[PDB]
């Protein structure tokens, strides 16, 4: 669980995202697929090209799950339990890939919110994404 100060930074930063969480999720995915091509093999039946309907849709889902996490910082394990079952049990997502997507999310936030993406906020968002990743890899038997 994040510090009080981190939770405050994370809720603050996410407020600056406005209604762009889905857009940012889509762009983070695109950055991941191009920057780290190994990750593409998780999406064999997606059109992964820019502006893809499927990537746009999927980014909305990732953004919505992160928005939900931001609203539930005191209980990420509870909030993300089912999604952790999916990513571990079913999808067998390599834990390394959560670091890759997290890096691409930070990159995307920096692109779009340069004035708000301060060093302290970068640190808190990094901790937030680490915490989310930890829950999402927690279901490994």
């Amino acid at each position: 669980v994040l510090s009080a100060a981190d939770k405050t930074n994370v809720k603050a930063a996410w407020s600056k995202v406005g209604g762009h969480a889905g857009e940012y999720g889509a762009e983070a995915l695109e950055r991941m697929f191009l920057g780290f091509p190994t990750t593409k093999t998780y999406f064999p039946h997606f059109d992964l090209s820019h502006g893809s309907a499927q990537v746009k849709a999927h980014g909305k889902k990732v953004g919505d799950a992160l928005t939900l996490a931001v609203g539930h910082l005191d209980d990420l394990p509870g909030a993300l339990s089912n999604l952790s079952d999916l990513h571990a049990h079913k999808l067998r997502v390599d834990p390394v890939n959560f670091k890759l997507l997290s890096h691409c999310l930070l990159s995307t936030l920096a692109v779009h919110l340069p004035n708000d993406f301060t060093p302290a906020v970068h640190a808190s968002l990094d901790k937030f994404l680490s915490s989310v990743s930890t829950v999402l890899t927690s279901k490994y038997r």
Binding site: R31, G35, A110, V111, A120
Partner: protein, 146 residues
């Protein structure tokens, strides 16, 4: 580095706009704030006790500029990163004993800083090329561990 001629051109074009002082100070300071264990290597730099102190520290800014200058050398010698970074690999590995995982972290912090500075001009494609670059630099820096 699996960088094509066209990717290479885009990478060098971006570096032409990089202020190594501002980008370098910011990348090193962010490393020290976001991954505070890295402060272990910088006791002589003075006050690093909070984000404001780290970012405003003259020694952090001066040193970050030097780091970014060496990254620029790498950018301009992509076909010989091993040779370019040989002396710095001896320094960081044999003399300082920095875990090489941190070379990757600093590369990724630099990528995030480039994203912040360049905004939409730092496209997913250009970032992908920069990921190849910073991976190559990290690998070259870690040569003395290989």
């Amino acid at each position: 580095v699996q960088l094509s001629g066209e990717e290479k051109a885009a990478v060098l074009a971006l570096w032409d706009k990089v202020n190594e002082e501002e980008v370098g100070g910011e990348a090193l300071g962010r490393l020290l704030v976001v991954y505070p264990w890295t402060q272990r290597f910088f006791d002589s730099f003075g006050d690093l006790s909070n984000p404001g102190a780290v970012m405003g520290n003259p020694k952090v800014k001066a040193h970050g500029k030097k780091v970014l200058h060496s990254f620029g050398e790498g950018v301009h010698h992509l076909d010989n990163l091993k040779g370019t970074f040989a002396a710095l690999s001896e320094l960081h590995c044999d003399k300082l004993h920095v875990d090489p995982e941190n070379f990757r972290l600093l590369g990724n912090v630099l990528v995030v800083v480039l994203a912040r500075h360049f905004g939409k001009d730092f496209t997913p494609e250009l970032q992908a090329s920069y990921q190849k670059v910073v991976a190559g630099v990290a690998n070259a820096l870690a040569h003395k561990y290989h």
